C-alpha cells in the first residue's frame, strides 16, 4: 500500500557482504516504520536524550544467534545497552498485528513493555513465541542471503561477531 523500502549496505571486516533491502509496513505500524526509516536516512537529527545522531550509518550488528537472528541498531553504545528513537528516548509498543510468522521479518528489540528505541533484529526462522512482545514492522525482500552470512559468523561467548559487521551505507529506495 503505502509501504516504503529501505536498505543497509553491510561490510564484514571491511569487505562488502551485500545489501539488505527491507519493506516497511507503514500501513500497519506507522510510528515504528517512521522511526526505522528516519534512522536509516539520518533525516530526524540528534537524539533528544543522548544528543547523538539518530542514524544507523557506521553502527554494527553486535549480536548474532545461529539459527535465529541478527541484531543491531545500537548507535550510541554499540553493544545492546544503547540506542534511542526519533521520538526522544523510547516509545510504546505500537501494534502486535504483524507477527513473526515467517523468517526474515524485521522486529524491534527491547528491554520490556514499551521500551522501543533504535535496536532491531531480523529473524531467520518463524518465532511466534515473540508475538505480543516484539513489534514486527517489516520484512527483508532482498538480500536475505546477506542476513544469513552475518548470522553464521564466528562469535565470542557473548554472541558478538569476532568480525566487524558494519552498516557501511543506509537509506531509502524505491
From Swiss-Prot:
The reply to whether Isomerase figures as a keyword in the UniProt entry is yes
Q: Which GO terms describe its biological process?
A: protein folding
Ranges for domain PPIase cyclophilin-type come to 7-172
Keywords, comma-separated and alphabetical: Isomerase, Rotamase
Keyword Isomerase (UniProt): yes
User: Which Gene Ontology MF annotations are present?
Assistant: cyclosporin A binding; peptidyl-prolyl cis-trans isomerase activity
Can you tell me which residues the record assigns to a coiled coil?
none
Q: Which Gene Ontology cellular component annotation is one that this UniProt entry carries?
A: mitochondrion
The role this protein plays is: PPIases accelerate the folding of proteins. It catalyzes the cis-trans isomerization of proline imidic peptide bonds in oligopeptides.
The protein's name is Peptidyl-prolyl cis-trans isomerase 1
| Species of the source | Brugia malayi
Taxonomic lineage: Eukaryota, Metazoa, Ecdysozoa, Nematoda, Chromadorea
State which stretch of the full-length protein is shown.
Answer: 4 to 177 of 843
Amino acid at each position: 500500500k503505502d509501504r516504503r523500502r529501505v536498505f543497509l549496505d553491510v561490510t564484514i571486516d571491511g569487505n562488502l557482504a551485500g545489501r539488505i533491502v527491507m519493506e516497511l509496513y507503514n500501513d500497519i505500524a506507522p510510528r515504528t516504520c517512521n522511526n526505522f526509516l528516519m534512522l536509516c536516512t539520518g533525516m530526524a537529527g540528534t537524539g533528544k536524550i543522548s544528543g547523538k545522531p539518530l542514524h544507523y550509518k557506521g553502527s554494527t550488528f553486535h549480536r548474532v544467534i545461529k539459527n535465529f537472528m541478527i541484531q543491531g541498531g545500537d548507535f550510541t553504545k554499540g553493544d545492546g545497552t544503547g540506542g534511542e528513537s526519533i521520538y526522544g528516548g523510547m516509545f510504546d509498543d505500537e501494534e502486535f498485528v504483524m507477527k513473526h510468522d515467517e523468517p526474515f521479518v524485521v522486529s524491534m528489540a527491547n528491554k520490556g513493555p514499551n521500551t522501543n528505541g533504535s535496536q532491531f533484529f531480523i529473524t531467520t526462522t518463524p518465532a511466534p513465541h515473540l508475538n505480543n512482545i516484539h513489534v514486527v514492522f517489516g520484512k527483508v525482500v532482498s538480500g536475505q542471503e546477506v542476513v544469513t552470512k552475518i548470522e553464521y559468523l564466528k562469535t565470542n561467548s557473548k554472541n558478538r561477531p569476532l568480525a566487524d559487521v558494519v552498516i557501511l551505507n543506509c537509506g531509502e529506495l524505491v
